[PDB]
Design a protein around this ligand. Structure first.
Ligand SMILES: NC(=[NH2+])c1cc2nc(-c3cccc(-c4ccccc4)c3[O-])[nH]c2cc1Cl
Ligand SMILES: [Ca+2]
Length: 223
């Protein structure tokens, strides 16, 4: 997260870190046994780390659980990143509490101008690589579809939306991918892609979760 702030330990209880010996992507807990992340964050050997703040220090509250299976969306396109969503089933259910809680799925899509909270342990520099130990937060609005398509002509599908600041300076970045975009307490987006981080007129693009609620529910119900 570039231009953001320290969230505060466990103030984002649904945030998870996907780990394979290092943190590579974020994700969101939606119930005690399933996490939603981005399809391009898929790899085998994933350990989901819940209740984290400093990802390099066991401070207490952490629960490390192995993924039993990862389900990348069948229509995920790695060249366009269209349908960039994946569900991860945990080997055992997590113990929920105030520090580890799930976030709700939306019932309707959000409108432009909605202010949302984006969080993660991704890079904090626009130019260079500086990864933080603790969780960073950023409040950012959903942009209009016309501004998004103007920024990324020909690359935005109806399963994506832009959020951020066109002036640059504040944005999500590498390492934040797969993590949550929460608006009014509902999970509306997943950190997906953008051109660089915090560049002027190049906002972040997020997977539009409201278009996948039936898919998520049906997939969880049959697995
Ligand atoms: N808001 C943005 N401008 C942005 C920049 C990103 N940059 C990345 C990114 C860059 C290189 C590698 C990865 C990566 C993907 C999968 C696994 C590990 C790293 C990224 O997510 N993801 C990004 C996601 C966003 Cl939304
Ligand atoms: Ca820790």
């Amino acid at each position: 997260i570039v231009g953001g702030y320290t969230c505060g330990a466990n103030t984002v209880p649904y945030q998870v870190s996907l780990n394979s010996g290092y943190h590579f992507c974020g994700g969101s807990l939606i119930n005690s046994q399933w996490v939603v992340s981005a399809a391009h964050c898929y790899k085998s050997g994933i350990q989901v780390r819940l209740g984290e703040d400093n990802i390099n220090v066991v401070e207490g509250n952490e629960q490390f659980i192995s993924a039993s299976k990862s389900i990348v969306h069948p229509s995920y396109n790695s060249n366009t990143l269209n349908n960039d969503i994946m569900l991860i089933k945990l080997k055992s259910a997590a113990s929920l509490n105030s520090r580890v809680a799930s976030i709700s799925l939306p019932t309707s899509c959000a409108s432009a101008g909605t202010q949302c909270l984006i969080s993660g342990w991704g890079n904090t520099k626009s130019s260079g690589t500086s990864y933080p130990d603790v969780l960073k937060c950023l409040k950012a609005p959903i942009l209009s579809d016309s501004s998004c398509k103007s920024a990324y002509p020909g690359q935005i599908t109806s399963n994506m939306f832009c959020a951020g600041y066109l002036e640059g300076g504040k944005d999500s970045c590498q390492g934040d991918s797969g993590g949550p975009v929460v608006c009014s307490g509902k999970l509306q987006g997943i950190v997906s892609w953008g051109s660089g981080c915090a560049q002027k007129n190049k906002p972040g693009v997020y997977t539009k979760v409201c278009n996948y609620v039936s898919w998520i529910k049906q997939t969880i119900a049959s697995n």
